[PDB]
């Protein structure tokens, strides 16, 4: 959300007139561990919540019925196809944004990579044994190359599907 | 921001440990009419707050000193160059996001386009006389073409620089 010039907070979880549901809101827009993303910042390959599921976007189009953006995606866990249209947020007069929901990632350190899985560490030292790596975009190979050349620098980006955890991307921290 | 599975709100306006400033936060991250944008969703040409100024991004690079993203941009109002690095948000354990600030746009209807300026209407009927159109990306020509072919469908995206208003993009509402 944002603050206006008078100090009032406005949330893009609000539809046509933390934040709480108001008339015109969708209960779908308050899913936990999700952030609102304006549609113009969404590109092919991005990760989005489609029908409540974490998906990789593979098609962006416009619905002729409504004129809003429509997103086709592949479930990161089940590999099923999902489809969802944007929802129109109008938090304040003349502020109208087509929005989508995206997942919140957790960053873990990588301690070991063996038998197709990683041993990861959370920020607080919690050791994650047998963390699966998504078979997508050659992630395991790039993860393992960066691991072999510098292990304290490698992080996995992890999503949680009601208890089932998946490393879906990586990051190399520099500086 | 987002909600965790327990109902607690978390804001990306928080640095290294509506929302209020905590220890480790930057006061810069609470500018009014700004939204937090994760750095991986930022592309060349996007609109960002750089040094507190609304800018068009023209270069994205990584700082060797800090390893964070660095953004070069052109002020939309003054046409001056501005430069700013991302700030690291850590709202919760293992949630670490490089973020930037972006402006909030207002959508106005277009009633008239003459002498290089538009007459606009806010959502509530407030008439904006003599609204300037940014000389950027052939906006005036595309705005005027869409206006001549369908006027109730055309919207300008407007930014405000401490009272000085500027139409910096357009949208054609369909459906």
Terminal Cα distance for chain B, rounded: 30
Phi, psi of A61 (to 5 degrees): -145, 180
Name residue, tokens 């008439």. B127
Closest Cα in chain A, distance from residue B11 (Å): 9
CB A69 within 8 A of CB A85: yes
Interface of A with B in 75-134 (CB under 8 A): 93-96, 104-108, 122-124
Using the Cβ of A172 and the Cβ atoms of chain B, whether some distance falls under 8 Å is answered with no
Which neighbouring-strand residues pair with B26? none
CA A128/CA A139 separation, integer angstroms: 18
CB contacts, 8 Å: B95 with chain A: 104-107
Tell me if chain A has a CB within 8 Å of the CB of B68. Answer: yes
User: Which overall architecture, per CATH, does domain B2-103 show?
Assistant: Roll (2.30)
Chain Cα centroid distance, residue B59: 16
Q: B104 vs A97, B21, B49, CA distance in Å?
A: 10, 21, 10
d(CA A56, CA A82): 10
Asked how this structure was determined, the answer is X-ray
Q: Is the dihedral of CA B112, B115, B116, B122 positive or negative?
A: negative
Point out which residues pair with A155 in neighbouring strands: A109, A171
Query: Between A and B, how many residue pairs show a Cβ–Cβ distance under 8 A?
Result: 99
Give A139-148's long-range contacts (Cβ < 8 A, gap of 24+). Answer: A139/A167, A139/A168, A139/A169, A139/A170, A140/A113, A140/A116, A142/A170, A143/A110, A143/A113, A143/A118, A143/A167, A143/A170, A144/A113, A146/A170, A146/A172, A147/A110, A147/A113
Sign of the CA dihedral with B95 first, then B98, B104, and B107 last: negative
Give the whole-angstrom CA distance, residue B143 versus residue B38. Answer: 30
The number of residues making up chain B comes to 175
Cα-Cα-Cα-Cα dihedral of B134, B161, B71, A49, to 10°? -90
d(CA B59, CA B43) in angstroms, rounded, equals: 9
Which residue(s) pair with B156 in the sheet?
A: B108, B170
Which residue of A18, A94, A104 is in closest CB contact with B107?
Answer: A94
3-state SS, residue A148: helix
The rounded distance, in Å, linking the Cα atoms of B125 and B108 is: 9
Resolution of the deposited coordinates, in angstroms? 2.0
Report whether B16 contacts B24 (CB < 8 A). Answer: yes
Q: Residue ranges per domain, chain B?
A: 2-103, 106-172
**What's the 3-state SS for B142-164?**
HHHHHHHHCCCCEEEEEEEECCE
Q: What is the DSSP string of A24-77?
A: T--GGGG-TTEEEEEGGG--TT-EEEETTEEEEEEEEEE-TTT--EEEEEEETT
Instruction: Return the bridge partners of A1, or none.
Output: none
Q: What top-level class would CATH report for the domain B106-172?
A: mainly beta
Contacts of A23 (CB under 8 A, 6+ apart): A17
């Amino acid at each position: 959300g944002y603050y206006d010039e008078d100090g009032h907070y406005h949330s893009f979880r609000h539809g046509i007139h933390g934040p709480r549901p108001r008339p015109g809101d969708s209960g779908d827009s308050y899913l936990p561990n999700t952030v609102t993303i304006p549609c113009h910042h969404i590109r092919l390959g991005d990760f989005l919540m489609l029908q409540g599921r974490p998906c990789q976007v593979i098609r962006i189009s416009t619905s002729p019925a409504t004129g809003q953006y429509r997103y086709l995606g592949v479930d990161l866990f089940t590999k099923q196809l999902h489809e969802e249209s944007s929802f129109i947020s109008n938090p304040a007069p003349s502020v109208v944004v087509q929005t989508m929901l995206g997942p919140v990632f957790k960053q873990y350190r990588v301690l070991d990579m063996h038998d197709g899985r990683v041993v990861a560490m959370t920020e607080t030292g919690d050791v994650k044994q047998g963390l699966a790596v998504i078979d997508q975009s050659n992630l395991w190979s790039r993860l393992h190359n960066a691991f072999e050349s510098g292990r304290g620098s490698v992080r996995v980006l992890v999503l949680n599907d009601s208890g089932r955890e998946l490393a879906v991307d990586m990051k190399v921290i520099h500086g």
